[PDB]
Protein backbone atom coordinates (compact mmCIF):
# COMPACT_ATOMS: atom_id res chain seq x y z
CA UNK A 1 0.00 0.00 0.00
CA UNK A 2 0.71 3.73 -0.13
CA UNK A 3 3.27 5.15 2.29
CA UNK A 4 5.57 8.13 2.96
CA UNK A 5 9.16 7.74 1.61
CA UNK A 6 12.18 9.90 2.59
CA UNK A 7 13.97 12.26 0.07
CA UNK A 8 9.81 24.09 36.18
CA UNK A 9 12.34 26.84 35.24
CA UNK A 10 13.03 30.62 34.99
CA UNK A 11 10.64 31.11 32.03
CA UNK A 12 10.43 34.57 30.43
CA UNK A 13 11.17 36.35 33.82
CA UNK A 14 8.64 37.71 36.39
CA UNK A 15 5.77 37.66 33.83
CA UNK A 16 4.62 35.01 31.38
CA UNK A 17 3.77 31.43 32.13
CA UNK A 18 5.93 29.08 34.26
CA UNK A 19 7.41 26.37 31.99
CA UNK A 20 6.26 22.73 32.21
CA UNK A 21 7.54 19.45 30.88
CA UNK A 22 5.92 16.02 30.69
CA UNK A 23 6.65 13.88 33.82
CA UNK A 24 7.09 10.84 31.49
CA UNK A 25 8.44 10.10 28.02
CA UNK A 26 9.88 13.57 28.13
CA UNK A 27 12.78 13.49 25.70
CA UNK A 28 11.83 10.52 23.46
CA UNK A 29 11.57 12.56 20.18
CA UNK A 30 14.85 14.48 20.76
CA UNK A 31 16.88 11.27 20.26
CA UNK A 32 14.94 9.74 17.29
CA UNK A 33 16.37 9.56 13.78
CA UNK A 34 15.02 12.69 12.07
CA UNK A 35 12.96 10.48 9.63
CA UNK A 36 10.68 9.48 12.57
CA UNK A 37 9.29 13.04 12.97
CA UNK A 38 10.37 14.88 9.75
CA UNK A 39 7.24 14.30 7.67
CA UNK A 40 7.79 17.51 5.56
CA UNK A 41 10.88 15.81 3.99
CA UNK A 42 8.92 12.69 3.01
CA UNK A 43 6.84 12.20 -0.10
CA UNK A 44 3.79 9.97 -0.50
CA UNK A 45 4.00 6.87 -2.77
CA UNK A 46 0.32 6.51 -3.70
CA UNK A 47 -1.65 3.27 -3.99
CA UNK A 48 -4.29 2.49 -6.62
CA UNK A 49 -7.57 4.31 -5.98
CA UNK A 50 -9.31 1.77 -8.31
CA UNK A 51 -8.78 -0.98 -5.62
CA UNK A 52 -11.58 0.61 -3.51
CA UNK A 53 -15.32 1.01 -4.18
CA UNK A 54 -17.66 2.89 -1.81
CA UNK A 55 -20.39 1.01 0.16
CA UNK A 56 -21.93 3.63 2.50
CA UNK A 57 -21.25 7.03 4.12
CA UNK A 58 -20.14 6.87 7.82
CA UNK A 59 -18.74 10.32 8.72
CA UNK A 60 -19.69 13.82 7.52
CA UNK A 61 -17.56 15.91 9.96
CA UNK A 62 -16.43 19.41 9.19
CA UNK A 63 -12.91 18.28 7.98
CA UNK A 64 -13.37 14.81 6.31
CA UNK A 65 -15.84 12.55 4.56
CA UNK A 66 -15.61 8.92 5.67
CA UNK A 67 -17.04 5.92 3.79
CA UNK A 68 -17.12 2.22 4.29
CA UNK A 69 -15.59 0.67 1.14
CA UNK A 70 -14.51 -2.74 -0.19
CA UNK A 71 -11.05 -3.54 -1.52
CA UNK A 72 -12.05 -5.28 -4.81
CA UNK A 73 -8.51 -6.87 -5.14
CA UNK A 74 -8.87 -9.06 -1.96
CA UNK A 75 -12.59 -8.49 -1.01
CA UNK A 76 -11.84 -6.95 2.49
CA UNK A 77 -13.91 -4.16 4.17
CA UNK A 78 -11.98 -0.90 4.62
CA UNK A 79 -12.80 2.68 5.51
CA UNK A 80 -11.82 5.57 3.27
CA UNK A 81 -11.24 9.01 4.85
CA UNK A 82 -11.37 11.70 2.19
CA UNK A 83 -9.50 14.75 3.48
CA UNK A 84 -11.28 18.13 2.95
CA UNK A 85 -8.99 21.09 2.01
CA UNK A 86 -6.29 21.32 4.71
CA UNK A 87 -2.49 21.88 4.96
CA UNK A 88 -0.42 19.36 2.96
CA UNK A 89 1.66 19.65 6.17
CA UNK A 90 -1.39 18.45 8.14
CA UNK A 91 -2.06 15.37 5.92
CA UNK A 92 1.58 14.19 5.94
CA UNK A 93 1.66 14.65 9.73
CA UNK A 94 -1.42 12.36 10.15
CA UNK A 95 0.18 9.82 7.76
CA UNK A 96 3.55 9.90 9.49
CA UNK A 97 2.01 9.38 12.94
CA UNK A 98 -0.20 6.54 11.69
CA UNK A 99 2.84 4.85 10.12
CA UNK A 100 4.95 5.37 13.25
CA UNK A 101 2.24 3.83 15.49
CA UNK A 102 1.09 1.07 13.06
CA UNK A 103 0.91 -2.34 14.73
CA UNK A 104 0.81 -0.87 18.27
CA UNK A 105 -1.84 -1.97 20.80
CA UNK A 106 -5.33 -0.79 19.85
CA UNK A 107 -4.01 1.68 17.22
CA UNK A 108 -6.05 1.80 13.98
CA UNK A 109 -4.14 0.37 11.02
CA UNK A 110 -3.51 2.64 7.96
CA UNK A 111 -3.71 0.21 5.01
CA UNK A 112 -3.24 2.52 2.01
CA UNK A 113 -3.03 6.14 0.79
CA UNK A 114 -4.68 7.06 -2.55
CA UNK A 115 -5.74 10.15 -4.43
CA UNK A 116 -8.23 11.15 -7.10
CA UNK A 117 -6.22 11.49 -10.36
CA UNK A 118 -8.71 14.26 -11.48
CA UNK A 119 -9.21 16.53 -8.36
CA UNK A 120 -5.98 15.31 -6.55
CA UNK A 121 -8.13 14.89 -3.35
CA UNK A 122 -6.20 12.49 -1.07
CA UNK A 123 -7.76 9.70 0.95
CA UNK A 124 -6.48 7.50 3.78
CA UNK A 125 -7.57 3.86 3.74
CA UNK A 126 -7.96 2.08 7.10
CA UNK A 127 -8.93 -1.26 8.49
CA UNK A 128 -12.69 -1.25 9.07
CA UNK A 129 -14.03 -1.51 12.66
CA UNK A 130 -17.71 -2.57 12.91
CA UNK A 131 -18.54 0.15 15.41
CA UNK A 132 -21.69 0.50 17.54
CA UNK A 133 -22.38 4.26 17.91
CA UNK A 134 -21.54 5.23 21.52
CA UNK A 135 -25.03 6.85 21.93
CA UNK A 136 -26.40 3.25 21.67
CA UNK A 137 -23.48 1.18 23.03
CA UNK A 138 -22.42 2.95 26.22
CA UNK A 139 -25.79 2.66 28.03
CA UNK A 140 -25.66 -1.21 27.46
CA UNK A 141 -22.16 -1.68 28.99
CA UNK A 142 -21.71 -3.52 32.29
CA UNK A 143 -19.30 -2.34 35.02
CA UNK A 144 -16.66 -4.83 33.76
CA UNK A 145 -17.18 -3.76 30.14
CA UNK A 146 -16.40 -0.07 31.03
CA UNK A 147 -13.27 -1.18 32.92
CA UNK A 148 -12.21 -3.44 30.00
CA UNK A 149 -12.62 -0.76 27.31
CA UNK A 150 -11.00 1.97 29.48
CA UNK A 151 -7.98 -0.37 29.86
CA UNK A 152 -7.87 -0.88 26.07
CA UNK A 153 -7.82 2.89 25.47
CA UNK A 154 -5.05 3.20 28.09
CA UNK A 155 -2.96 0.61 26.22
CA UNK A 156 -3.24 2.77 23.09
CA UNK A 157 -2.39 6.01 24.99
CA UNK A 158 0.54 4.54 26.91
CA UNK A 159 1.80 3.24 23.58
CA UNK A 160 1.39 6.51 21.66
CA UNK A 161 2.77 8.64 24.54
CA UNK A 162 5.79 6.23 24.80
CA UNK A 163 6.28 6.85 21.04
CA UNK A 164 6.33 10.64 21.63
CA UNK A 165 2.83 11.40 20.32
CA UNK A 166 -0.06 13.30 21.92
CA UNK A 167 -3.42 12.28 20.41
CA UNK A 168 -5.18 15.58 21.29
CA UNK A 169 -8.72 14.46 20.35
CA UNK A 170 -9.67 11.64 22.70
CA UNK A 171 -13.50 11.33 22.74
CA UNK A 172 -16.14 8.67 22.01
CA UNK A 173 -16.40 9.51 18.29
CA UNK A 174 -12.65 8.69 17.94
CA UNK A 175 -12.90 5.31 19.72
CA UNK A 176 -14.21 2.53 17.51
CA UNK A 177 -15.57 -0.61 19.22
CA UNK A 178 -16.64 -3.88 17.55
CA UNK A 179 -18.53 -5.03 20.61
CA UNK A 180 -19.11 -8.61 19.31
CA UNK A 181 -15.31 -9.04 19.34
CA UNK A 182 -14.44 -6.75 22.32
CA UNK A 183 -12.22 -5.04 19.70
CA UNK A 184 -11.31 -1.36 20.37
CA UNK A 185 -9.31 0.93 18.13
CA UNK A 186 -8.20 4.51 18.82
CA UNK A 187 -8.75 6.32 15.50
CA UNK A 188 -8.39 9.90 14.26
CA UNK A 189 -4.74 10.89 14.44
CA UNK A 190 -5.35 14.10 12.43
CA UNK A 191 -4.76 16.42 15.43
CA UNK A 192 -2.03 14.24 16.92
CA UNK A 193 1.41 15.84 17.37
CA UNK A 194 4.97 15.03 18.36
CA UNK A 195 5.81 16.10 21.93
CA UNK A 196 8.97 18.22 22.39
CA UNK A 197 9.81 19.50 25.87
CA UNK A 198 9.42 23.28 26.16
CA UNK A 199 7.39 23.60 22.94
CA UNK A 200 4.31 25.91 22.98
CA UNK A 201 1.38 24.23 21.17
CA UNK A 202 -1.89 25.53 19.73
CA UNK A 203 -4.70 25.26 22.32
CA UNK A 204 -7.37 24.97 19.53
CA UNK A 205 -7.30 21.15 19.70
CA UNK A 206 -9.63 18.49 21.09
CA UNK A 207 -13.38 18.92 21.18
CA UNK A 208 -15.03 21.37 23.65
CA UNK A 209 -16.48 18.80 26.09
CA UNK A 210 -13.12 16.93 26.32
CA UNK A 211 -10.78 19.96 26.47
CA UNK A 212 -8.45 20.05 29.43
CA UNK A 213 -8.28 23.17 31.60
CA UNK A 214 -4.85 23.95 30.11
CA UNK A 215 -6.55 24.50 26.72
CA UNK A 216 -9.42 26.53 28.27
CA UNK A 217 -7.02 28.93 30.12
CA UNK A 218 -4.61 29.17 27.10
CA UNK A 219 -1.59 27.41 28.72
CA UNK A 220 0.35 26.33 25.62
CA UNK A 221 3.20 24.23 27.15
CA UNK A 222 1.01 21.12 27.56
CA UNK A 223 1.87 17.49 26.99
CA UNK A 224 0.52 13.90 26.89
CA UNK A 225 -1.46 14.59 30.10
CA UNK A 226 -4.07 16.46 27.99
CA UNK A 227 -5.27 13.05 26.75
CA UNK A 228 -5.71 11.87 30.34
CA UNK A 229 -8.18 14.72 31.09
CA UNK A 230 -10.15 13.77 27.94
CA UNK A 231 -10.22 10.14 29.04
CA UNK A 232 -11.52 11.21 32.48
CA UNK A 233 -14.36 13.08 30.77
CA UNK A 234 -15.22 9.86 28.87
CA UNK A 235 -15.09 7.74 32.05
CA UNK A 236 -17.39 10.15 33.95
CA UNK A 237 -19.93 10.10 31.07
CA UNK A 238 -19.88 6.23 31.05
CA UNK A 239 -20.13 5.49 34.83
CA UNK A 240 -22.66 8.29 35.52
CA UNK A 241 -24.68 7.83 32.23
CA UNK A 242 -24.35 11.57 31.55
CA UNK A 243 -23.15 12.44 28.03
CA UNK A 244 -21.32 14.70 27.82
CA UNK A 245 -20.31 15.03 31.44
CA UNK A 246 -19.18 18.71 31.26
CA UNK A 247 -21.64 20.28 28.82
CA UNK A 248 -20.37 23.84 28.17
CA UNK A 249 -22.08 26.23 25.71
CA UNK A 250 -18.66 27.58 24.55
CA UNK A 251 -14.97 27.37 25.62
CA UNK A 252 -15.44 29.90 28.48
CA UNK A 253 -18.63 28.23 29.77
CA UNK A 254 -16.80 24.84 29.52
CA UNK A 255 -14.37 25.95 32.24
CA UNK A 256 -17.29 27.24 34.37
CA UNK A 257 -19.02 23.81 34.07
CA UNK A 258 -15.81 22.09 35.23
CA UNK A 259 -15.34 24.60 38.11
CA UNK A 260 -18.92 24.01 39.34
CA UNK A 261 -17.89 20.36 39.95
CA UNK A 262 -14.15 20.37 40.85
CA UNK A 263 -14.41 23.69 42.67
CA UNK A 264 -12.43 26.92 42.07
CA UNK A 265 -9.87 26.45 44.92
CA UNK A 266 -7.76 24.01 42.87
CA UNK A 267 -8.36 26.05 39.65
CA UNK A 268 -7.02 29.29 41.15
CA UNK A 269 -4.13 27.30 42.74
CA UNK A 270 -3.31 25.96 39.20
CA UNK A 271 -3.46 29.42 37.62
CA UNK A 272 -1.20 30.77 40.39
CA UNK A 273 1.31 27.87 40.17
CA UNK A 274 1.88 28.32 36.42
CA UNK A 275 1.42 32.16 36.44
CA UNK A 276 -1.36 31.80 33.81
CA UNK A 277 -2.93 35.06 32.56
CA UNK A 278 -6.67 34.28 32.84
CA UNK A 279 -8.71 35.89 29.97
CA UNK A 280 -10.64 38.85 31.48
CA UNK A 281 -13.86 37.31 30.00
CA UNK A 282 -13.67 34.91 33.00
CA UNK A 283 -14.06 37.86 35.49
CA UNK A 284 -17.91 37.90 35.32
CA UNK A 285 -18.60 34.19 34.81
CA UNK A 286 -16.16 31.91 36.80
CA UNK A 287 -16.70 33.15 40.40
CA UNK A 288 -16.02 30.81 43.34
CA UNK A 289 -17.50 27.31 43.68
CA UNK A 290 -17.27 24.55 46.25
CA UNK A 291 -15.82 21.15 45.21
CA UNK A 292 -18.65 18.58 44.84
CA UNK A 293 -18.18 14.98 46.04
CA UNK A 294 -18.06 12.48 43.08
CA UNK A 295 -20.87 10.65 45.04
CA UNK A 296 -23.50 13.37 44.03
CA UNK A 297 -23.71 12.04 40.37
CA UNK A 298 -24.70 8.49 41.56
CA UNK A 299 -28.41 7.47 41.18
CA UNK A 300 -30.53 4.25 40.94
CA UNK A 301 -29.88 3.85 37.14
CA UNK A 302 -26.02 4.16 37.25
CA UNK A 303 -25.13 2.84 40.75
CA UNK A 304 -24.10 -0.61 39.40
CA UNK A 305 -21.34 1.15 37.34
CA UNK A 306 -19.91 3.12 40.29
CA UNK A 307 -17.51 1.72 42.92
CA UNK A 308 -15.12 3.38 45.37
CA UNK A 309 -12.31 2.36 42.96
CA UNK A 310 -14.07 4.04 39.98
CA UNK A 311 -14.49 7.32 41.85
CA UNK A 312 -10.88 7.29 43.14
CA UNK A 313 -9.60 6.63 39.56
CA UNK A 314 -11.82 9.40 38.11
CA UNK A 315 -10.62 11.82 40.83
CA UNK A 316 -6.99 11.11 39.81
CA UNK A 317 -7.67 11.82 36.06
CA UNK A 318 -9.82 15.00 36.49
CA UNK A 319 -7.17 17.24 38.11
CA UNK A 320 -6.69 20.83 36.94
CA UNK A 321 -2.92 20.53 37.30
CA UNK A 322 -1.86 18.53 34.22
CA UNK A 323 1.30 17.42 36.08
CA UNK A 324 -0.85 15.89 38.88
CA UNK A 325 -2.95 13.61 36.62
CA UNK A 326 -2.19 9.92 36.36
CA UNK A 327 -0.10 8.96 33.33
CA UNK A 328 -1.56 6.24 31.11
CA UNK A 329 0.76 3.59 32.65
CA UNK A 330 0.01 4.78 36.19
CA UNK A 331 -3.73 4.63 35.34
CA UNK A 332 -3.33 1.01 34.13
CA UNK A 333 -1.88 0.15 37.61
CA UNK A 334 -4.93 1.58 39.47
CA UNK A 335 -7.06 -0.85 41.59
CA UNK A 336 -10.03 -0.10 39.28
CA UNK A 337 -8.33 -2.42 36.73
CA UNK A 338 -7.17 -5.25 39.05
CA UNK A 339 -9.67 -7.77 37.54
CA UNK A 340 -9.04 -6.66 33.92
CA UNK A 341 -5.24 -7.08 34.47
CA UNK A 342 -5.58 -10.71 35.73
CA UNK A 343 -7.74 -11.46 32.58
CA UNK A 344 -4.93 -9.78 30.49
Amino acid sequence: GGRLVPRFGEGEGSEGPVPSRARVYTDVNTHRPSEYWDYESHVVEWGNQDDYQLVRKLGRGKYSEVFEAINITNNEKVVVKILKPVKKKKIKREIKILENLRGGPNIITLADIVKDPVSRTPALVFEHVNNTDFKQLYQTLTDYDIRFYMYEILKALDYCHSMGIMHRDVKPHNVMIDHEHRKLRLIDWGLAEFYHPGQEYNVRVASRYFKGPELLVDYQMYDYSLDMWSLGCMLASMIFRKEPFFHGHDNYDQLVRIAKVLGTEDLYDYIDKYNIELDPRFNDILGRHSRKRWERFVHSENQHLVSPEALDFLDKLLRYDHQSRLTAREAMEHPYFYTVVKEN
Binding site: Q49, L54, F67, I82, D116, V118, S119
Partner: peptide
Amino acid sequence: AARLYGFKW
Protein backbone atom coordinates in the same frame (compact mmCIF):
# COMPACT_ATOMS: atom_id res chain seq x y z
CA ALA B 1 -21.81 5.06 -13.41
CA ALA B 2 -21.01 7.18 -10.31
CA ARG B 3 -17.68 8.40 -8.90
CA LEU B 4 -17.13 10.49 -5.78
CA TYR B 5 -13.65 12.03 -5.18
CA GLY B 6 -12.50 9.49 -7.82
CA PHE B 7 -13.92 6.40 -6.03
CA LYS B 8 -16.51 4.31 -7.90
CA TRP B 9 -19.66 3.58 -5.88
